[PDB]
């Protein structure tokens, strides 16, 4: 492959990583008080999980996958009219809400990997108008998945408040008013030895919701593992700013992405957290002489400034703000 993908020895992924066979599957179906202690556990041991009968329609998850997959398979000249000035955007602040292709990276590399992201909260005509033109059903699919997912995501975030002791509806506010959504496309790589899709990293945000029907999703545990792709199920990943909000009684998922030499894969995922206007801290109503605060209260855009910049270390957005 090109040099610019070339991942540092130390980055690049081992050719056989085994299958978690640990990670949580949580039905959403058994008893309200069974649901909230599973979650609960996940939350706290591993920082990834899948949800199953999660009452978003599977018909509607194929749609998307769908027609995500057809606007990769869209020319050129299409794919043009998302590259401002002639390039791929790149993820720095301001991130901006209107739809483009991303390109991304990090000894300064690039990551097997084109990105469609655009915001999808609140709804709105303009919002939807800034989307991308085609495929002709993306808009119409995609606002529909939009606000599935969101509702999906409030219901994980409740019975993540009751599993803590919180008030219902802690995250529904300033903390949630941001929901990316990526669509990813890992075309197939003569070199996988050599590239990654995506970096090892912890999600910067509150929670993400992913879709994929295909491997090449690692957890780190020391070891990584692979995440079994269930296609009707999502993944969820905690982020660093809900780490930090639980003042750490919660995990961070660290995952990476690798390449495929022979198949093409697309994935999509959901990214709800703050504004870029919050102040984020650890619960108050959480803390206390046996559970001194780990963090002082941060800048969100700041945090953001650092996260999107400076990957010397997984946690170098939050290590500016750790105190006792
Ligand atoms: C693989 N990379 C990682 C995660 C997804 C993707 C793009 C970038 O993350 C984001 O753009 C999200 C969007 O909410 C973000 C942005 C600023 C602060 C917190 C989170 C970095
Ligand atoms: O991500
Ligand atoms: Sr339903
Ligand atoms: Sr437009
Ligand atoms: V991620």
């Not at 949800?51 to 769908?66: F, Q, R, Y």
């Not at 998302?82 to 720095?92: I, N």
Request: hydrophobic letters at 35%; charged letters at 25%.
């Amino acid at each position: 492959v090109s040099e610019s993908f070339v991942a540092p020895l130390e980055k690049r992924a081992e050719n056989d990583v085994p299958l978690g066979n640990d990670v949580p599957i949580i039905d959403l179906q058994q008893d309200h008080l069974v649901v909230v202690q599973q979650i609960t556990k996940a939350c706290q041991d591993f920082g990834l999980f899948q949800v199953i009968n999660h009452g978003l329609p599977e018909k509607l998850m194929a749609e998307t996958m769908d027609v995500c997959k057809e606007f990769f398979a869209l020319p050129a000249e299409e794919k043009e009219k998302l590259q401002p000035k002639g390039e791929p955007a790149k993820f720095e602040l301001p991130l901006e809400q209107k739809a483009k292709l991303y390109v991304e990276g990090e000894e300064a590399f690039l990551y097997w990997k084109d990105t469609l992201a655009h915001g999808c909260h609140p709804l709105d005509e303009e919002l939807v108008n800034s989307w991308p033109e085609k495929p002709a059903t993306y808009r119409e699919v995609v606002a529909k998945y939009s606000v599935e997912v969101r509702k999906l995501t409030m219901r994980i975030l409740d019975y993540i408040c009751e599993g803590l002791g919180l008030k219902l509806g802690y995250f529904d506010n300033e903390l949630s008013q941001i929901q990316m959504m990526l669509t990813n496309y890992y075309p197939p790589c003569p070199d996988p030895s050599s590239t990654l899709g995506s970096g090892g990293h912890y999600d910067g945000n509150l929670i993400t919701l992913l879709q994929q029907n295909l491997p090449g999703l690692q957890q780190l545990i020391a070891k990584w593992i692979a995440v079994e792709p269930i296609p009707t199920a999502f993944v969820v990943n905690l982020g660093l700013t809900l780490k930090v909000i639980t003042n750490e009684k919660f995990e961070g998922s660290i995952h990476r992405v690798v390449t495929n030499p022979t198949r093409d894969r697309v994935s999509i995922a959901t990214f709800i957290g703050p504004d870029y206007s919050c102040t984020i801290e650890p619960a108050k109503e959480l803390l206390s002489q046996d559970n001194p605060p780990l963090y002082k209260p941060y800048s969100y855009a700041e945090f953001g400034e650092i996260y999107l910049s400076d990957k010397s270390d997984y946690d170098a957005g939050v290590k500016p703000y750790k105190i006792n």
